[PDB]
Amino acid sequence: TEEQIAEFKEAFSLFDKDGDGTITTKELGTVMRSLGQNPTEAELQDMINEVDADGNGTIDFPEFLTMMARKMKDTDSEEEIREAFRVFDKDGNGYISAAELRHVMTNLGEKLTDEEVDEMIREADIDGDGQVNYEEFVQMMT
Ligand SMILES: CC1(C)c2[nH]c3cc(Cl)c(Cl)cc3c2C[C@@]23CN4CCC[C@]4(C[C@@H]12)C(=O)N3
Ligand SMILES: [Ca+2]
Ligand SMILES: [Ca+2]
Ligand SMILES: [Ca+2]
Ligand SMILES: [Ca+2]
Ligand SMILES: [Zn+2]
Numbered sequence: 001t002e003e004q005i006a007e008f009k010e011a012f013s014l015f016d017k018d019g020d021g022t023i024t025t026k027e028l029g030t031v032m033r034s035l036g037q038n039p040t041e042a043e044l045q046d047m048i049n050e051v052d053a054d055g056n057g058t059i060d061f062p063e064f065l066t067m068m069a070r071k072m073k074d075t076d077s078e079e080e081i082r083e084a085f086r087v088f089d090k091d092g093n094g095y096i097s098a099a100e101l102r103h104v105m106t107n108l109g110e111k112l113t114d115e116e117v118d119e120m121i122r123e124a125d126i127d128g129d130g131q132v133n134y135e136e137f138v139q140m141m142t
Helices: 002-015 025-034 041-051 061-069 073-088 098-107 114-124 134-141
Strands: none
Touching: 002 025, 002 061, 025 041, 041 061, 041 073, 061 073, 073 098, 073 134, 098 114, 114 134
16 A cells, blocks of 8 residues: 555654664664563564664664564565566566566666576576576575
């Protein structure tokens, strides 16, 4: 929803007391304690680490959407990698062929040669079927 998001940026701004675009443990604890909870500092750090995709100890708005989605960061990252994968998997069959890779990359401004493309598919083609599936796409990227 679009207004579910607008609600969420409202929430984020409230929690981000000082407006610097990040939520700290202290800001998080203030909110938790205002709702009748007594989380330890370790527990507050844990809440943050669970969505802390960039590893900087604070929550920004994109990581907060993970938290509002309630999710863990690996789950969230998997859903984002799958969205990138579907950009390349034009026919939607679950495999990035060499032609799909060449086509999408060209239309995104990167034209590689034919044998660059064939080697990119080869490199990430673990099981040797000639195409790049999702798990191979994840691996390729790490
Ligand atoms: C040139 C890159 C490294 C790459 N190399 C590939 C090899 C294969 Cl086999 C396939 Cl299918 C796709 C790619 C892509 C698309 C990528 C994925 N990377 C993730 C982080 C940055 C970057 C760079 C770029 C990105 O944003 N787009
Ligand atoms: Ca802040
Ligand atoms: Ca962060
Ligand atoms: Ca495909
Ligand atoms: Ca494969
Ligand atoms: Zn995310």
